[PDB]
Design a protein around this ligand. Structure first.
Ligand SMILES: [Mn+2]
Ligand SMILES: [Mn+2]
Length: 455
């Protein structure tokens, strides 16, 4: 039993001062007036963050992401994130269960926090459609990802997208899409290389906002025609939110997600002398700064509901470096898993962009609800897992590769002044991080079976 006292509990809806009693792996009592004491005076007691978008230990050519399920979850913990949902990638001629078994082996005995899996659908043939019933019912995976981009690699066509959408409505699954028109980007990419435009900045220029807008709109119309439910991952521009906002007005089950990088960074940082811009190469690419306001406005008024990181790190030296000759050879992705919460609090709450309660809803609660992990995770209430973060809102610090915990040689926020510091982190009643010190253990984290889609 653990007794957190003196702190101010903050959830998606409430804000009060009281003690929370933990017994075993869960919260068993909350209130005022024989247990492990933990002082949380002057700090916020919030639900551990939930990052529904990660790519830990992901392969890419002959190299792999700098972080694996161990260093990745440890960094996630230090950042105040207690649960993650990683993307299990599949390959045509795909046996969904073999890919799934592959992912469990990646996490098994390494994760320090709880994790769930999303399942990529490369193609929707009779076989895949049949297997799908077992994955949703037995494997606890109720979210499927379809790529509308990355031609000749992962891209799926409208037939695959639509079939998946009706199947998901039938089985109670949530469909996620990476929305960028794969074909227009493929054409623009080759063209840029033919004209000798090989600098990292052309990565951004070869995939215009409208390409994300078009794809976002298409996926939504297909969702409507199928009467299903859709979740658009990493929305980066005004063009895409506009389409999402429109569908929401019509009462369609369409949800959206953003990431720290699109909220606090912009394309102008890609235009740098040497090969510096390669540090910010990820898809979708950073956009013009005006788009940040639109995203923040959408999060404030409920147009977008979640915030993930899309953590997919590669060192600048030794990995990002493969693309020196041309941007298409630069492995995509950034080290974003650790600073998601803090920038959300510092740039969002402290600057009056969103309320403290929304802060919790956007970084934990809503993701738990959309991906079937609630009320086990995503809140502080009797019966829920004791996944708690003791956050110090009065701390001022600078984000730096010098002090971060991700196993990568750089931080995309290098030098950014922020408010807020994660002090202690509990995962199912056990300390993973205590007083800024790591006390967890590899393999402590567990797989979470997710329930079917619920509005
Ligand atoms: Mn993506
Ligand atoms: Mn991703």
């Amino acid at each position: 039993k653990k007794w957190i006292r003196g702190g101010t509990v903050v959830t998606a809806a409430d804000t009060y001062q009281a003690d929370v009693l933990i017994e075993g792996e869960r919260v068993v009592a909350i209130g005022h007036q024989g247990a492990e004491e933990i002082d949380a005076t002057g700090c916020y007691v919030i639900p551990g963050g939930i990052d529904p978008h990660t790519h830990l230990d992901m392969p890419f050519g002959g190299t792999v992401t700098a972080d694996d399920f161990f260093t990745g979850t440890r960094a996630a913990a230090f950042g105040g994130t207690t649960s993650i949902v990683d993307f299990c990638l599949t390959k045509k001629g795909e046996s969904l269960k073999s890919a799934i078994a592959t992912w469990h082996e990646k996490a098994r005995g390494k994760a320090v926090i709880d994790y769930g899996f999303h399942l990529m659908i490369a193609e929707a043939n009779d076989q895949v459609l049949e297997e799908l019933e077992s994955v949703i019912s037995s494997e606890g995976i109720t979210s499927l990802k379809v790529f509308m981009a990355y031609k000749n690699v992962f891209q799926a066509d409208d037939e695959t997208l639509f079939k998946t959408l009706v199947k998901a409505k039938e089985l109670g699954a949530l469909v996620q899409v990476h929305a960028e028109n794969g074909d227009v980007l493929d054409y623009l990419t080759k063209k840029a290389l033919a004209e000798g435009n090989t600098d990292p900045i052309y990565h951004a220029y070869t995939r215009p906002p409208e390409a994300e807008g078009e794809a976002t709109g298409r996926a939504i119309a297909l969702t409507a025609l199928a009467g299903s439910q859709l979740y658009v991952v990493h929305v980066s521009c005004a063009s895409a939110v506009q389409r999402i906002a429109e569908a929401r007005e019509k009462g369609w089950n369409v949800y959206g997600e953003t990431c720290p990088q699109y909220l606090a960074l912009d394309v102008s940082i890609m235009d740098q002398p040497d090969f510096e811009g390669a540090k910010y190469v990820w898809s979708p690419p950073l956009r013009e700064k005006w788009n940040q306001e639109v995203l923040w406005s959408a999060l404030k008024n409920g147009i977008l509901q979640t915030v993930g990181s899309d953590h997919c790190p590669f060192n600048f030296r030794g990995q990002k470096e493969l693309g020196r000759g041309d941007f298409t050879k630069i492995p995509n992705g950034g080290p974003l898993i650790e600073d998601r919460l803090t920038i959300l609090y510092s740039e969002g709450v402290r600057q009056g962009r969103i309320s403290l309660n929304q802060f919790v809803d956007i970084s934990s609660t809503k993701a738990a609800k959309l991906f079937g992990m609630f009320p086990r995770k995503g809140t502080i209430a009797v019966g829920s897992d004791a996944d708690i973060v003791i956050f110090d809102p009065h701390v001022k610090r600078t984000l730096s590769v010098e002090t971060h915990h991700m196993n990568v040689d750089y931080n995309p926020f290098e030098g950014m002044e922020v408010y807020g510091e994660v002090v202690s982190v509990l995962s199912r009643g056990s300390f993973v991080v205590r007083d800024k010190q790591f006390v967890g253990q590899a393999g402590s984290g567990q797989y979470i079976k997710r329930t079917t889609f619920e509005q």
